[PDB]
Design a protein around this ligand. Structure first.
Ligand SMILES: *[C@@H]1O[C@H](CO)[C@@H](O[C@@H]2O[C@H](CO)[C@@H](O[C@@H]3O[C@H](CO[C@H]4O[C@H](CO)[C@@H](O)[C@H](O)[C@@H]4O)[C@@H](O)[C@H](O[C@H]4O[C@H](CO)[C@@H](O)[C@H](O)[C@@H]4O)[C@@H]3O)[C@H](O)[C@H]2NC(C)=O)[C@H](O)[C@H]1NC(C)=O
Ligand SMILES: *[C@@H]1O[C@H](CO)[C@@H](O[C@@H]2O[C@H](CO)[C@@H](O[C@@H]3O[C@H](CO)[C@@H](O)[C@H](O)[C@@H]3O)[C@H](O)[C@H]2NC(C)=O)[C@H](O)[C@H]1NC(C)=O
Ligand SMILES: *[C@@H]1O[C@H](CO)[C@@H](O[C@@H]2O[C@H](CO)[C@@H](O[C@@H]3O[C@H](CO)[C@@H](O)[C@H](O)[C@@H]3O)[C@H](O)[C@H]2NC(C)=O)[C@H](O)[C@H]1NC(C)=O
Ligand SMILES: *[C@@H]1O[C@H](CO)[C@@H](O[C@@H]2O[C@H](CO)[C@@H](O)[C@H](O)[C@H]2NC(C)=O)[C@H](O)[C@H]1NC(C)=O
Ligand SMILES: *[C@@H]1O[C@H](CO)[C@@H](O)[C@H](O)[C@H]1NC(C)=O
Ligand SMILES: *[C@@H]1O[C@H](CO)[C@@H](O)[C@H](O)[C@H]1NC(C)=O
Ligand SMILES: *[C@@H]1O[C@H](CO)[C@@H](O)[C@H](O)[C@H]1NC(C)=O
Ligand SMILES: [Ca+2]
Ligand SMILES: [Ca+2]
Ligand SMILES: [Ca+2]
Ligand SMILES: [Ca+2]
Lengths: 673, 884
């Protein structure tokens, strides 16, 4: 299949050459004066040479599935995978996950208290008897908590002085509460009516800047339940605001350059740190939040629906809920919560060391046959229908024994996956044949590994003073080749490549022909530096995810993809994260052809064949006019305005899209004769 | 890779928010910021100037008006060099308008002049909606030849902008209009930077929160325009794409080449951070922050891209280098990075240095928040860097990087066979070979003449046949197989030859004896401590080896004739223009009609514009190259040319056998070389060239160059047909406007040709047609009439109503052009009263007359790149449909 010889001293050093590398233990396999590295070829070649089939060693990766009794863990099995991983070779172990049901719930209502959230506070101040009612079906005795929030106390987020601070309420001043940011009004409790009444109590407030500072509240909530308290089972939150959201960096406005620590420090169920403290970064939640098994449920105006939509992409376990400005259909949010919140099955892992690389597979229940990708995104599984993730762990070198975990984001079930550096092959000892190797060496699967000072395929020679005549037979590749290809002095038939104390430099081979320095370069680096690929006798063996003569096409990925997720839009192969746009179409993703004339000609005939019905001329239309779309909307971009078949000026824009002659038109409902 | 991490200066002035924002003042001083240095009643902060002479910071005098309150100045800083000035700012002024106060911002201009204050100090009186109440102008500032520029954030719907101040003339301002519906709450102007050019200046503002993701927008200030050039959305939500920005100069041409961007809070799997490189394409409505790359690091929650500044040429390879902060690295500890340019729009993802907060920074939490460098302040020659940190601010100088060239030779070229096979009655007469090595430093521009740039001590370490445990010789001075001696270098060579002793009798003779040197920079004491530590560059081939061949025994006689020939060609090579045909495939064949050549070498001569790259082909081919060979490029000729030798490394070339291999030379898209490029091929054996007439093989090729030349028919074109046609009038003059432009990369003369119909069987089509050339000098154009083939035009246009020049006596206009500079959109139009008389001549209606416009240029020397683009031949078809 494939096997290039690295320095081969033992059966193990033949293994460290590549996947398609096999080794032969059968003794007397070395000819009168043949190299010991010949024992390391491909399985096919070995049989063609004579090497027996049962003599072909091939130490392989496999998986140990030590399954538990039961109740150990619930729907993440196996529970303990002790893999024996050989470098370069992938070990595969499956993961059965059949979610069951619903555990003890624990909600928390993060509501923005602004003057815009007035009729929201009214139509919501006490509708919690239907929440436990909506909780009754699936889960049983859950918990209910509340937390208010507005925006940082200090400006520029809201006027800090003066007594409009005591009275922010615009115009009405109905005794609204002082400007705040996070007030833990209610703790997680069983009761429901006590919860409702403790809410209506507090009234709204107000601030200056339009977007809110609700992000600071997020952390402070799930930061120290040593004062807020939280169930050890489930924890769902729900964001609610008819306004934006401020993240890290914005704090520099308020003269505060102290970043977010992560822990809340309140003394009266009320923040007094957010002022001397900067906003939680956008990504400081998907970590801390998902660490405490908490998951917000976006539910805001339709004005802020597609902004939290992009936020759903990033952070895990989060749904989008477009609702009216009255927060009346707020309870239907959770009918849509479990809908696709008990659907996002995740399967990530603790940040593994760089010396390892992990991947997964996916076999969703409804049709999907995915393969090879991190995560376990299957948004098509709910209650009692198992799934399948094929975890494939590979190493680059002989790792040191360690252990990591593969958790499901938003789940307490830890799977302690043990990892064992498997890098050996095992035969015999030095009680058998202290004779051969002339006493100064031991034997292992045929060949003999000599001492520090003895060398040779039988520990016969010494590194001080040897040669013969026709021992130089297999010491040169051919009769017209220099001995040991230079850079190597022949001893006892074989060659001992010389050594260079130069970074990277290394000679090797029977005749010392191959080096690990003289290959194809890239970006002023050998085979693309140590990162991309490596060098081995001219050809570059690029690391995984990199191909090309010298890893020149660095990435096998496709940054050639746009948000449309179609490569290079209209035309252009995706070579090395670059597009080869046809015609004058320009980079990066081939959409704008700056030089293209702007053909409205030849399009008039079809423009009056779609909007107007003035006779598909040449033939019919929808055939001679593959500009199939004619949206009933104000599209724009290529503002065209030419004439019709007979006199009248027919106006119409022309928004092209993606590939070749594909278009999208809106022909003005008007003419001019 | 030369940022001092030992002997530096540290200013630890404990003043609250001290060392939170810093800038390079006039070269002599560095200004730090302490916004939270409480003064009076919840008022300003204060500034501090620090000098190198004495490690101490002196307060700076300021007339803080009672008007400006809680402005916490110093938060935003900025300095120019033009004349040396500085700009400090309180971006948090509080003015009480009763019901509610707001934030205006107040800045101060200092220097060796008048202490100006310039919003300017029209204390901004009091007045959903907003206008300019909480715009905190001066939040970020940067200078420019035509007056400073401060940035507002809360402009209107917190859209943003930047107030430009001219020379005592009333200031202007640039928002994004209101017609721009979006951009609500984006802090446009959070960060600001210049973008000078060979032409007019260009500003840039950072909008961290455009649609809550982050976009960066670039603006131009054309005469009576001040519109937008272009922009680029963010990559991810919350990424904060727009935080930091830095226009940097990959080279030193003085025109800003590219622009960096910040997004400390970005990720996909690791939240290290994100900086984005985004060159500055010219030609609005197109601009990509994706000239590929974007620097990062393998450490989550690092805030990488928090700040950054142009540092300039530090390593002296003509390639400016930049610095980037990341105060979130490690356990909240600080961090900084160093990158280098390459060629034009690009940087090197792999950084050379990563000085972090682990550098016996005893105990500072986050460092690198901000930083600005490029100025020589310690007055030791080369530039310096200033990086602010919580509590204190540090200065890292740039250690001199010199590199040296070396020459190796063996006085006795080869070995005379005298002390070769030897004999055993009487002696070892050990032959005496001499090996002379020389050392000289050449690339010096930065360090300049004088102390340091000259004197240095060095340790030398010569060693023969290292890789083998069979020393083929020894030096006499020490008697060992190697030796070392510390000797003084200079910009002027230093040559010393050493004595070598070859034993009369030896086994291996075929393999020349190698001699390599390990050399470095020992001691590093040089006069004063104003150099401290010099060092070498990245590409330090400190291991240089030279070979000594032997007089190979070609028999007990026969004299050993060295006879080798050589000949090469270029398979399929057609025309070779610079741009296409980057790789250059050479098929070299070679002979051996004499004695066996062992270490046969084959060297080429070529213009600077190319070098050799390993082919490494496999897969498969052919009757053909098989061949591991070692090649070493190197500069030779007086000025321009240089040789790339290539010795067939490890095997023999025997008998009258011929062999063919493939050697490819990459050629640069900007290859400076004559209208013709020649190249040769010296061929010889390992045993050198013992005799007279060299066997060199050369050939000379015509060279051309790539160019992008395009032309369109502007949509201001007269298609005017209409039914009112009672008589045969004259003047409804039509207007064919043609716009042209070249996206090539070289200034090149051109000549734009035209074709406008007129005479048509004595019946003029449209008369007195001339061509205007607005927005450009009065150029000279030619005029010539010509008569078409004269076919039956009756049936001709009956096919197609068109009226090309092939029917009606056309008119060619040859508008020559001195030098069509690249990027120049030189455009112009042509008009003439269009007669209605000829319309009847052909007896039809709805006819249409066409003009063809085709650009040309010397087919030789220049040529269009992609294959073949007809983008240099536009067309405009007007219609004369007039009925009744
Ligand atoms: C920079 O960016 C801004 C905003 O992005 C661009 O648009 C300006 O936006 C404001 C929006 O409010 C436009 O409105 C102006 O309102 C001022 C005062 O408020 C009036 O309108 C509000 C809301 O209707 C009422 O509640 C209030 O009672 C007022 O009626 C007016 O003073 C502005 O001036 C207008 O009338 C004056 C009369 O003196 C005329 O001189 C002006 O031309 C104008 O008609 C205005 O009505 C404002 O129009 C926008 N400015 C401009 C210049 O168009 C800006 O365009 C942009 N600036 C630049 C220079 O490009
Ligand atoms: C030229 O090169 C050679 C070899 O590279 C230098 O010889 C000695 O080489 C060794 C590396 O094999 C140096 O490293 C030693 O390494 C350990 C760490 O691995 C370190 O603890 C020791 O302090 C030592 O550095 C060794 O330094 C080096 N010898 C000396 C005297 O520095 C040779 O020195 C080089 N020629 C010079 C310096 O002129
Ligand atoms: C094959 O070619 C190269 C260059 O042609 C030889 O390298 C050295 O080249 C230089 C010229 O750059 C020779 O120096 C002199 O050239 C100048 C004119 O430019 C002339 O004034 C001098 O009289 C001399 O010719 C130099 O001699 C030559 N090096 C050697 C060792 O001779 C190279 O030598 C050639 N390869 C061989 C001979 O194997
Ligand atoms: C500036 O204002 C701050 C409050 O914004 C003052 O800080 C304290 O504020 C509380 C609450 O109003 C007062 O009760 C304290 O008396 C203030 N502390 C002190 C020590 O006075 C702060 O004092 C003000 N600074 C100045 C000097 O005007
Ligand atoms: C895992 O599942 C796949 C698909 O069902 C199956 O083909 C494979 O054999 C399984 N792997 C293991 C280790 O059982
Ligand atoms: C050795 O190499 C080749 C390939 O088999 C052959 O053509 C030739 O005659 C051989 N040389 C000797 C001297 O045996
Ligand atoms: C002499 O040679 C030995 C062995 O090669 C070497 O280790 C030693 O450094 C040399 N001594 C001197 C004085 O150069
Ligand atoms: Ca509401
Ligand atoms: Ca530049
Ligand atoms: Ca440089
Ligand atoms: Ca300096």
């Amino acid at each position: 299949q494939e096997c290039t010889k690295f320095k081969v001293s033992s059966c193990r050093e033949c293994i460290e050459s590549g996947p398609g590398c096999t080794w032969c233990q059968k003794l007397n396999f070395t000819g009168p004066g043949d190299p010991d590295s010949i024992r390391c070829d491909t399985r096919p070649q070995l049989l063609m040479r004579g090497c027996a089939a049962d003599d072909i060693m091939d130490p392989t990766s496999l998986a140990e599935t030590q399954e538990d009794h039961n109740g150990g863990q619930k729907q993440l099995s196996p529970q303990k995978v002790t893999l024996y991983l050989r470098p370069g070779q992938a070990a595969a172990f499956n993961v059965t996950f059949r979610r069951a049901k619903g555990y003890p719930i624990d909600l928390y209502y993060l509501m923005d208290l602004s003057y815009s959230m007035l009729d929201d506070l009214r139509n919501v101040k006490k509708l919690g008897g239907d929440l436990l009612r909506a909780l009754n079906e699936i889960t049983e005795s859950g918990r209910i908590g509340f937390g208010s929030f507005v925006d940082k106390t200090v400006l520029p987020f809201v006027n800090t002085h003066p007594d409009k601070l005591r009275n922010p309420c615009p115009n009405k001043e109905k005794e609204c509460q002082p400007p705040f940011a996070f007030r833990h009004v209610l703790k997680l409790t069983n009761n429901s009516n006590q919860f409702q009444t403790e809410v209506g109590k507090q009234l709204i407030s107000g601030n200056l800047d339009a977007p809110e500072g609700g992000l600071d509240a997020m952390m402070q909530v799930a930061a120290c339940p040593e004062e807020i308290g939280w169930r050890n089972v489930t924890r769902l939150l729900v964001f609610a605001t008819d306004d934006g959201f401020h993240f890290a960096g914005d704090g520099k406005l308020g003269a505060i350059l102290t970043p977010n620590d992560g822990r809340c420090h309140l003394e009266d169920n009320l923040y007094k740190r957010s002022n001397e403290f900067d906003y939680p970064s956008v990504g400081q939640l998907a970590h801390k939040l998902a660490e405490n098994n908490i998951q917000p449920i976006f539910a805001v105006t339709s004005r802020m629906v597609k902004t939290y939509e992009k936020l759903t992409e990033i952070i895990p376990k989060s749904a989008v809920g477009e609702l009216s400005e009255d927060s009346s259909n707020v309870v239907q949010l959770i009918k849509n919560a479990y809908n696709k919140l008990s659907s996002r099955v995740f399967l990530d892992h603790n940040a593994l060391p760089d010396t390892l690389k992990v991947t997964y597979d996916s076999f969703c229940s409804n049709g999907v046959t995915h393969r090879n990708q991190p995560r376990g995104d299957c948004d098509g599984v709910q209650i009692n229908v198992p799934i399948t993730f094929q975890v494939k762990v590979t190493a680059t070198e002989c790792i040191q024994e360690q252990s990591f975990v593969i958790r499901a984001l938003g789940f307490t079930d830890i799977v302690t996956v043990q990892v064992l550096p498997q890098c050996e092959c095992r035969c015999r000892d030095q009680s058998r044949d202290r004779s051969l190797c002339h006493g100064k060496g031991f034997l292992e699967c045929g060949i003999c590994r000599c001492d520090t000072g003895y060398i040779g395929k039988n520990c016969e020679c010494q590194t001080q003073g040897r040669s013969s005549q026709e021992l130089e037979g297999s010491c040169r590749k051919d009769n017209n080749s220099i001995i040991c290809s230079g850079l190597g002095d022949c001893v006892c038939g074989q060659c001992l490549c010389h050594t260079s104390d130069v970074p990277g430099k290394l000679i090797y081979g029977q005749y010392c022909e191959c080096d690990t320095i003289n290959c194809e370069r890239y970006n002023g680096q050998v085979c693309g530096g140590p990162g991309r690929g490596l060098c081995f006798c001219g050809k570059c063996r690029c690391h995984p995810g990199f191909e090309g003569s010298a890893c020149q096409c660095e990435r096998t990925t496709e940054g050639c993809l746009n948000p449309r997720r179609v490569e290079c839009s209209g035309r252009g192969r995706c070579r090395c994260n670059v597009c080869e746009c046809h015609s004058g179409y320009q980079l990066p993703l081939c959409q704008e052809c700056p030089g293209c004339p702007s053909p409205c000609g030849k399009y008039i005939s079809c423009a009056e064949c779609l909007k107007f019905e003035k006779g598909p001329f040449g033939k019919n239309c929808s055939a001679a006019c593959p500009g199939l779309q004619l949206s009933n909307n104000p599209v724009k971009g290529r503002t065209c305005k030419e004439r019709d078949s007979e006199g009248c000026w027919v106006a119409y824009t022309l928004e092209q899209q993606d590939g070749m002659d594909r278009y999208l038109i809106y022909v003005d409902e008007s003419r001019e004769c | 890779f030369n940022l001092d991490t030992e002997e530096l200066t540290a200013f630890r002035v404990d003043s609250a928010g001290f060392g939170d924002s810093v800038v390079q003042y006039a070269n002599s001083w560095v200004v730090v910021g302490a916004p939270q240095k409480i003064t009076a009643a919840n008022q300003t902060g204060g500034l501090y100037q620090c000098g190198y002479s004495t490690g101490a910071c002196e307060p700076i005098g300021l007339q803080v008006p009672p008007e400006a309150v809680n402005m916490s100045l110093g938060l935003s800083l900025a300095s120019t060099t033009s004349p040396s000035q500085l700009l400090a700012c309180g971006p948090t002024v509080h003015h009480e308008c009763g019901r509610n106060m707001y934030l205006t911002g107040l800045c101060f201009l200092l220097g060796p002049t008048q202490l100006t204050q310039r919003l300017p100090v029209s204390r901004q009186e009091c007045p959903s909606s907003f206008e300019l109440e909480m715009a905190q102008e001066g939040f970020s500032a940067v200078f420019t030849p035509d007056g400073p520029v401060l940035g507002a954030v809360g402009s209107f719907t917190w859209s943003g902008g930047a107030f430009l101040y001219p020379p005592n003339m009333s200031p202007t301002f640039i928002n994004m209009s209101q017609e721009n519906v979006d951009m609500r709450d984006s802090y446009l102007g959070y960060s600001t930077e210049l973008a000078l050019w060979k032409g007019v200046q260009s500003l840039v503002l950072g909008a961290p929160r455009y649609q809550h993701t982050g976009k960066a927008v670039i603006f131009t200030q054309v005469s009576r325009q001040w519109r937008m050039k272009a922009e680029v959305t963010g990559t991810q939500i919350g990424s904060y794409f727009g935080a930091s920005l830095c226009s940097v100069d990959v080279d030193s041409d003085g025109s800003t080449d590219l622009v960096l961007i910040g997004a400390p809070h970005y990720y996909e799997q690791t939240r290290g951070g994100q900086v984005s490189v985004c060159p500055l394409p010219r030609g609005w409505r197109r601009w990509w922050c994706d000239a590929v790359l974007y620097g990062e690091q393998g450490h989550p929650w690092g805030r990488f891209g928090a700040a950054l500044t142009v540092l300039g040429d530090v390593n002296g390879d003509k390639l400016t280098d930049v610095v980037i902060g990341a105060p979130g690295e490690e356990e909240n500890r600080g961090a900084v990075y160093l990158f280098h340019g390459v060629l034009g729009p690009s940087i090197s993802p792999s950084h050379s240095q990563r000085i972090a907060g682990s550098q016996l920074s005893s105990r500072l939490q986050y460092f690198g928040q901000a930083l600005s460098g490029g100025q020589d302040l310690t007055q030791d020659g080369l530039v310096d860097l200033a990086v602010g940190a919580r509590g204190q601010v540090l200065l890292l100088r740039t250690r001199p990087v010199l590199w040296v060239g070396v020459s190796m030779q063996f006085i006795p070229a080869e070995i005379p066979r005298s002390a070769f096979e030897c004999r055993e009655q009487v002696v070892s007469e050990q032959t005496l070979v001499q090996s002379n090595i020389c050392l000289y430093i050449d690339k010096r521009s930065k360090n300049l003449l004088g102390s340091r740039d000259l004197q240095s001590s060095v340790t030398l370490d010569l060693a023969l046949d290292p890789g083998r445990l069979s020393p083929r010789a020894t030096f006499q001075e020490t008697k060992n197989r190697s030796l070392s001696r510390v000797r003084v270098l200079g910009l002027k060579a230093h040559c010393e030859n050493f004595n070598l002793l070859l034993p009369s009798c030896v086994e291996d003779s075929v393999t020349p004896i190698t001699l390599r040197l390990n050399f470095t920079l020992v001691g590093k004491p040089l006069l004063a401590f104003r150099n401290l530590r010099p060092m070498l560059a990245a590409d330090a081939q400190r291991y240089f080896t030279a070979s000594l061949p032997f007089e190979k025994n070609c028999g007990a006689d026969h004299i050993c004739q060295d006879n080798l020939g050589i000949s090469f060609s270029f398979p399929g090579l057609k025309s070779l223009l610079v741009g296409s045909n980057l790789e250059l495939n050479a098929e070299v064949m070679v002979w051996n009609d004499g004695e066996d050549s062992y270490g046969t070498t084959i060297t080429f001569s070529h213009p600077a514009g190319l070098s050799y790259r390993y082919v490494a082909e496999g897969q498969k081919q052919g009757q053909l190259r098989s061949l591991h060979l070692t090649c070493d490029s190197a500069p030779v000729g007086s000025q321009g040319t240089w040789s790339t030798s290539c010795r067939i490394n490890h095997l023999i070339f025997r008998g009258g056998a011929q062999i063919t291999f493939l050697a490819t030379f990459d050629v640069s898209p900007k290859a400076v070389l004559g209208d013709r490029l020649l190249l040769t091929a010296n061929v010889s054996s390992e045993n050198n060239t013992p005799r007279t007439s060299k066997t060199t093989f050369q050939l000379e090729l015509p060279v051309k160059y790539a160019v992008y030349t395009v032309v369109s028919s502007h949509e201001q074109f007269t298609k005017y047909l209409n039914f009112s046609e009672s008589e045969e009038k004259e003047s409804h003059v039509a207007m064919h406007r043609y716009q042209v432009n070249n996206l090539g990369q070289r200034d090149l003369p051109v000549s734009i040709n035209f074709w406008v119909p007129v005479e048509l069987n004595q019946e003029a089509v449209w008369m007195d047609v001339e061509v205007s050339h607005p927005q450009n000098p009065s150029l000279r154009c030619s005029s010539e009439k010509i008569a078409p083939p004269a076919s039956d035009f009756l049936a001709h246009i009956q096919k197609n109503p068109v009226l090309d020049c092939s029917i009606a006596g056309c008119l060619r206009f040859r508008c020559d052009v001195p030098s069509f500079s690249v990027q120049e959109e030189l455009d112009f139009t042509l008009k003439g009263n269009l007669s209605f008389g000829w319309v009847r001549q052909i007896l039809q209606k709805k006819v249409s007359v066409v003009s063809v416009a085709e650009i040309t240029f010397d087919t030789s020397v220049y040529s269009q790149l992609p294959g073949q683009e007809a983008f240099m031949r536009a067309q405009t078809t007007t219609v004369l449909e007039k009925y009744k």
